[PDB]
Structure formats: C-alpha cells, structure tokens
Amino acid sequence: KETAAAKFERQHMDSSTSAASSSNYCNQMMKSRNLTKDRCKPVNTFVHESLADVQAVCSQKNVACKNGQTNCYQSYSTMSITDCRETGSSKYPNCAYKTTQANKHIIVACEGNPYVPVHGDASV
C-alpha cells in the first residue's frame, strides 16, 4: 500500500523541529506517525534535517549495508537525530519510549528512480 520511499519519510523524517527538546518527544512522535497502531515499534530514529538534505545522502558516501547490500550511503556530515527505543515499563496498547537526541552521520539504503532513501541503516 505504502511505497518504500513514503514509508521511510513517515518513519524517519521530522524536519519541523531542530532537536527533541523534551523527554516525551518519542512517545508523541511514535504515536503521531502511527508506529504503535497494532504494536509498539521497538526502535526508531527521526532525523531533524530537511527532506532534501536526507535525500541528498543517496549521492554521498557509498558504504556496505549491515546485510552486505551495496546500496547504502553515509552522510558526509552529522545530522540532528532523535533515537526512540521502547522502555521497560512499556506494553501495548500503552507504549513508552526513551528519547535520545544526538548528532550523528546517518546511513540509508537507496533505491528507485528517483534514487531515494527506502531504509535507514544503523546510523553511524
């Protein structure tokens, strides 16, 4: 139903904020982006850069994917990101996440025409 590129945007893009300035950021975002509809997605990362900046990574450093694929790319620069990980006292339908803001290089798998991100590899 959802194209891979569209799914990547919904799960990983948050260009409206510069960084997570609250401990409840993940709880709110995971719900908003519909990542806990039928189950709590254990881990997810949101990138605080423009969509153009993230799409541009597909033309940056080509690196191997965690599974051997060769269509992965690492951003030349660090980007503001927020890591969301399910908390211990977390249980669907009441999911709970820990919010970890950081600045790191992202790694994405790209595909298609246009050649865009479709998966977000273990961001450096």
- Which domains can be identified in the chain, with CATH numbers? 1-124 (3.10.130.10)
Out of 8, 9, 11, 12, which one is annotated catalytic?
12
Whether 12 is catalytic: yes
- Selected catalytic residue, list 119, 120, 121, 123: 119
- Distance from C-alpha of 17 to C-alpha of 99, rounded to nearest angstrom: 14
The Cα-based distances of 8 to 21, 74, 97, 119 in angstroms read 23, 16, 20, 6
Deposited resolution, Å:
1.4
Nearest to 114 by CA among 15, 9, 1, 16: 9
* Number of residues in the chain: 124
Residue 44 marked ligand-binding: yes
* 41 belongs to an annotated ligand binding site: yes
Strands 72-74 and 79-86: unpaired
Residue 40 contacts by C-beta under 8 Å, 6 or more apart in sequence?
30, 86, 90, 91, 92, 95
Annotated binding-site residue? 10 = yes
Look up residue 29 and give its amino acid.
M
Of the candidates 80, 79, 119, 82, the residue with the CA atom closest to the CA atom of residue 97: 82
Tell me, letter by letter, the H, E, C secondary structure of the chain. Answer: CCCHHHHHHHHHECCCCCCCCCCCHHHHHHHHCCCCCCCCCCEEEEECCCHHHHHHHHHCEEECCCCCCCCEEECCCCEEEEEEEECCCCECCECCEEEEEEEECCEEEEECCCCEEEEEECCC
- Report the 10 Å Cβ neighbour count for 117: 28
